Amino acid sequence: GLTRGSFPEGFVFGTASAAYQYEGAVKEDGRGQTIWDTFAHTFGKITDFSNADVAVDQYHRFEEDIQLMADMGMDAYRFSIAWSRIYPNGVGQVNQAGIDHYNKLIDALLAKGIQPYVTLYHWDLPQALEDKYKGWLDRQIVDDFAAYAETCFREFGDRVKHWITLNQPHTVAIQGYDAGLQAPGRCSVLLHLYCKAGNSGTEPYVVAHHFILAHAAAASIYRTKYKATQNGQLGIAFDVMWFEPMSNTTIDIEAAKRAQEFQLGWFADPFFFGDYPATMRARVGERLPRFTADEAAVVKGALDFVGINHYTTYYTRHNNTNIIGTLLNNTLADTGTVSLPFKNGKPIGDRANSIWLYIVPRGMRSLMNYVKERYNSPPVYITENGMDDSNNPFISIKDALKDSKRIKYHNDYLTNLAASIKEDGCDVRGYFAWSLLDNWEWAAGYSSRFGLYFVDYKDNLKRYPKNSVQWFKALLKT
Ligand SMILES: *[C@H]1O[C@H](CO)[C@@H](O)[C@H](O)[C@H]1O
């Protein structure tokens, strides 16, 4: 079946990680508090009462983990820099120990022939900026993020040639500010009583606007000051569910397209065309910010590549609502759609551990074609794809390693990806499995095991290879 030969020469295979989910050492070497330290230490926010204070301790164990990557023949590793290790208070005094740590990590990767693909922002905003101005809700975040990015370009860009400014701005806008299920946990209290403050109808759009501007500000710095010498590239990782119409009818086909425009187009249309999708302007109206002429000119073209984080495909139908009015405005109502993994009483596919993660390999190919067609064939990396096992205390570790479902998932999604490149002409350059290790899965805590390696939380975080490790090693062989 699949081999490296199934993909273009030079195609990059990696695994992905994120600082807060992996590093631990949350108070070590001057690290500043982040919104996720606060959130994980707040009652009710994490389903299994857990936090990432130690996580899988990659802060201390990265050399071990790098050898695990090399064991499989991985080309690359996607990891994030914790902003609060570099600027513990978001701005001001740089923390030299943070710079030193990530230099050691980058050098240890390169020593093993593994290329670093670095995410600047993977959700862990320094708490000091949240306290000062409510973080992404204030335009000041644009300058502060750009200054932090510049520091990273200056310190690491001689070696780091692939930068992901932001991870899943759509997820952050919706989960952090509409549903209030992720940090900082804001929403309309009339929609969800557990939130302390917010507005599900307005705040997600403000946050998204600031993400877009923050990327463009960092990209402007990179292009003007670093890119010529460093010869690297900058992109963003978008979370993108594929949507299929719930019926093959004009109304539902149009609904599926609209759902996609509200998910990916919300961010990608500015970066390619210099404004939000027309459907969003029509439906969100005055709650959707407007770019100035000068902003649009810095935003349009600001990506070198499109990172796609994709897991699943849902069915989408048209939806007519009338809801009061301002008080219950929210982003799902704004889309005029409903999406779910069920049609005519049947699931769209098998499901992984996560209650949202339906196994639909064809969606990978459909999405690659959508991106090529809508955005004129930009370079794409799959910056995240994979699935999770449950954390099951009632089975042996040996049985937990038999991840035949994960093997079939990666096999099927990669087969579809390979076809989108070979038969469809999609410009895909690389693929990053989520995730190298089992890790702290945000509000799901330790209940979800996404790793190629099993982590024994009961035995000093010992790493054991699941069956998928051999599968990838055989795939990647030369
Ligand atoms: C991609 O999705 C995984 C699983 O939910 C998550 O752990 C990452 O942080 C996200 O970027």
Rounded to the nearest angstrom, the distance between the alpha carbon of 311 and the centre of ligand 1 is: 10
In a 13 Å sphere around the CA of 249, the CA atoms on its Cβ side amount to: 8
Structurally, what CATH architecture does the domain formed by 1-478 represent? Alpha-Beta Barrel (3.20)
φ/ψ of residue 284, rounded to 5:
-90, -25
Please identify, by atom number, the ligand 1 atom nearest to the C-alpha of residue 357.
Answer: 5
Other beta carbons within 10 Å of 111: 11
- Calpha distance 272→314 (Å, rounded): 25
What method was applied to determine this entry? Answer: X-ray
Q: Give 145's strand partners.
A: none
Rounded to the nearest angstrom, the distance between the alpha carbon of 128 and the centre of ligand 1 is: 24
Which of 164, 175, 442 to mutate to test ligand 1, by most ligand atoms within 8 A of the CB atom? 442
- First and final CA of the chain: distance in angstroms? 15
Three-class SS state of 440: coil
Please identify, by atom number, the ligand 1 atom nearest to the C-alpha of residue 123.
Answer: 9
Asked if residue 386 lies in contact with residue 312, where contact means CB atoms within 8 angstroms, the answer is: no
Asked if residue 32 lies in contact with residue 126, where contact means CB atoms within 8 angstroms, the answer is: yes
Three-class SS state of 261: helix
- Calpha distance 127→97 (Å, rounded): 19
Three-class SS state of 126: strand
Q: Is 434 in the pocket of ligand 1 (CB under 6 A)?
A: yes
Q: Is 384 in the pocket of ligand 1 (CB under 6 A)?
A: yes
Q: Give 76's strand partners.
A: 14, 115
Q: Is 175 in the pocket of ligand 1 (CB under 6 A)?
A: no
Three-class SS state of 234: strand
Closest listed residue to residue 13, CA positions, set 63, 107, 78 = 78
- Calpha distance 15→307 (Å, rounded): 14
Resolution of the experimental structure, in angstroms: 1.9
- Calpha distance 175→323 (Å, rounded): 21
Q: Is 121 in the pocket of ligand 1 (CB under 6 A)?
A: no
Please identify, by atom number, the ligand 1 atom nearest to the C-alpha of residue 388.
Answer: 4
Asked if residue 85 lies in contact with residue 152, where contact means CB atoms within 8 angstroms, the answer is: no
Q: Give the closest residue (by CA) to ligand 1 atom 7.
A: 441
